[PDB]
Design a protein around this ligand. Structure first.
Ligand SMILES: Cc1cc2nc3c(=O)[nH]c(=O)nc-3n(C[C@H](O)[C@H](O)[C@H](O)COP(=O)(O)O)c2cc1C
Ligand SMILES: CC(C)CCC[C@@H](C)[C@H]1CC[C@H]2[C@@H]3CC=C4C[C@@H](O)CC[C@]4(C)[C@H]3CC[C@]12C
Ligand SMILES: CC1=CC[C@@H]2[C@@H](C1)c1c(O)cc(C(C)(C)CCCCCCBr)cc1OC2(C)C
Ligand SMILES: CCCCCCCC/C=C\CCCCCCCC(=O)OC[C@H](O)CO
Ligand SMILES: CCCCCCCC/C=C\CCCCCCCC(=O)OC[C@H](O)CO
Ligand SMILES: CCCCCCCC/C=C\CCCCCCCC(=O)O
Ligand SMILES: CCCCCCCC/C=C\CCCCCCCC(=O)O
Length: 428
């Protein structure tokens, strides 16, 4: 019975008509304009491809037109269609909107690969490869929407029918959910991965291993760490007496070695610093930015010779010395300006927030639009559908149009080349 699938409340039909026609027309005119500026940009600029932006516009323009027409016709006009004709109209909507998420899926792959393997990115993502991928992605989407027409429906299969969608075997619906859920979850994973990855590299991490006996070099390290705390470093200052040599510097943009000079007859390192000094090769110092500091006294012939021995092994082990050592004579509290001045100099030698906002918005948009829609379908596969939920679905089906309306704003508007191409269409 076709009439069981219809929102029949006249007040509800009107709201369905208002939202559908308003959003659909804005969506049609938006993506139409995007396609217009794509083709004008290709007239004057050879370099920007617009593969993702163009594909998404075609998918949304086609989908909104087929949807809004069939949707208004079915719910407001109560078209009783032959089974196959209805599946045909459903097929267009399914292919276009499945193509829309596939386009978002391929763009997500492009960005994920850029972050995951930035050097190899120029080999794996090529203009010839992208053309083939988008062509195949579109083809798969059409084939997925043609099976009910070919006979993957409940009437020919003699199986349970969907309560949400007329003439739809539940197994086909469950299959279609799994395809879209995998695409959507990867898009979620990719961008969540990118946010995590960017967050770690945002703030630099500093590592101060200090060896002091009477607390002088500790006071220097603590005075140094406080200056780096103001600049927004993630400082971990460790007494040398309690450290693991292996991988000690792992994951640090900057390492600071503060040792005291303690030679009675000849130069000697501070005792707690000595086991760490012997195991420098194990610390993975090679290729790391390091600076040295230390306390001492001018009365002794070798002024801060400990800072000399360390830098000589670090420069030999391959760590890049950012600056020459910091050498203090007498109480460091007297030279506090020289200490804090040093931090600034060594700090001197060496987030993409706007991007971060955009990625979160997409995920918020995606979760808001596809989430509730798919969940109701999951219900229909397993449980029983009452009139209330059917009604909710009709209004939730409108959520997809919204996604089609904001997509030009999210991506096309954000493209620098497109804005230059739009301005190009004016006399100047
Ligand atoms: C036996 C002895 C030997 C020292 N030898 C040196 C030295 O060779 N070169 C130097 O600059 N200072 C030398 N000093 C001075 C110390 O490095 C000074 O006290 C330093 O500030 C200790 O600070 P700390 O508490 O951080 O270890 C020596 C001090 C002592 C008691
Ligand atoms: C309405 C649905 C069911 C059928 C759609 C048929 C036509 C419109 C489809 C089939 C193949 C599709 C093309 C396949 C490849 C791409 C490359 C992409 O970077 C821009 C879109 C573009 C050029 C597609 C445009 C739309 C397209 C030509
Ligand atoms: C009852 C009913 C009659 C007209 C239907 C209408 C449902 C409908 C709908 O409610 C939701 C969707 C979407 C936008 C949510 C896509 C659903 C894709 C499902 C794929 C697996 Br069956 C498509 C839409 O297509 C038409 C033909 C207008
Ligand atoms: C742009 C908007 C989408 C195209 C506008 C779709 C207009 C829908 C008109 C319609 O529903 O056609 C009913 C007609 O009476 C036959 O039954
Ligand atoms: C395997 C290679 C996958 C293709 C990479 C891709 O997705 O290309 C999208 C890009 O946005 C195209 O401009
Ligand atoms: C904006 C969203 C809907 C606007 C349509 C107005 C709805 C009419 C009120 C319902 C009623 O007639 O009781
Ligand atoms: C007819 C349907 C689509 C044809 C319009 C093609 C515009 C997209 C071009 C984007 C691109 O050059 O990659």
């Amino acid at each position: 019975d076709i009439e069981c699938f219809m929102v029949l409340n006249p007040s509800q039909q009107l709201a369905i008509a208002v939202l559908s026609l308003t959003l659909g027309t804005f969506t049609v005119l938006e993506n139409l304009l995007v396609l217009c500026v794509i083709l004008h940009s290709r007239s004057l600029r050879c370099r920007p491809s617009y593969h993702f932006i163009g594909s998404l516009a075609v998918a949304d323009l086609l989908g909104s037109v087929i949807f809004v027409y069939s949707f208004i016709d079915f719910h407001v006009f109560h078209r009783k269609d032959s089974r196959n004709v209805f599946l045909f109209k459903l097929g267009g909507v399914t292919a276009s909107f499945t193509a829309s998420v596939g386009s978002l899926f391929l763009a997500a792959i492009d960005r994920y690969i850029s972050i995951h393997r930035p050097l190899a990115y120029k080999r794996i993502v090529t203009r010839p490869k992208a053309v083939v991928a988008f062509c195949l992605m579109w083809t798969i989407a059409i084939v997925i929407a043609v099976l009910p027409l070919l006979g993957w429906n409940c009437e020919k299969l003699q199986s349970v029918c969907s309560d949400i969608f007329p003439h739809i075997d539940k197994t086909y619906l469950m299959f279609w959910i799994g395809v879209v859920s995998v695409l959507l979850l990867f898009i979620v994973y990719a961008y969540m991965y990118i946010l995590w990855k960017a967050h770690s590299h945002a703030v630099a991490k500093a590592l101060i291993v200090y060896g002091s006996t009477t607390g002088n070099t500790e006071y220097t390290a603590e005075t140094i760490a406080r200056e780096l705390a103001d600049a927004g470093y993630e400082v971990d200052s460790r007494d040398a007496a309690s450290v693991e040599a292996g991988g000690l510097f792992e994951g640090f943009d900057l390492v600071l070695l503060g040792c005291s000079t303690w030679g009675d007859d000849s130069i000697e390192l501070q005792d707690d610093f000595i086991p760490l000094f012997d195991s420098l090769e194990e610390t993975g110092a090679q290729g790391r930015k390091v600076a040295c500091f230390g306390c001492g006294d001018s009365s002794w012939e070798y002024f801060c010779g400990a800072v000399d021995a360390i830098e000589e092994k670090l420069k030999n082990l391959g760590a890049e010395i950012v600056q020459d050592g910091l050498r203090i004579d007498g109480d460091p509290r007297a030279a506090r300006d020289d200490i804090v001045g040093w931090a600034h100099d060594v700090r001197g030698a060496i987030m993409d927030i706007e991007l971060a906002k955009t990625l979160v918005l997409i995920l918020v948009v995606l979760i808001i639009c596809w989430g509730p829609l798919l969940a109701i379908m999951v219900y229909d596969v397993f449980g029983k559908m009452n009139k209330l939920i059917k009604t909710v679905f009709a209004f939730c089906s409108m959520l997809c149009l919204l996604n089609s309306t904001v997509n030009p704003i999210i991506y096309a508007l954000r493209s620098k080349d497109l804005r230059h191409a739009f301005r190009s269409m004016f006399p100047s």
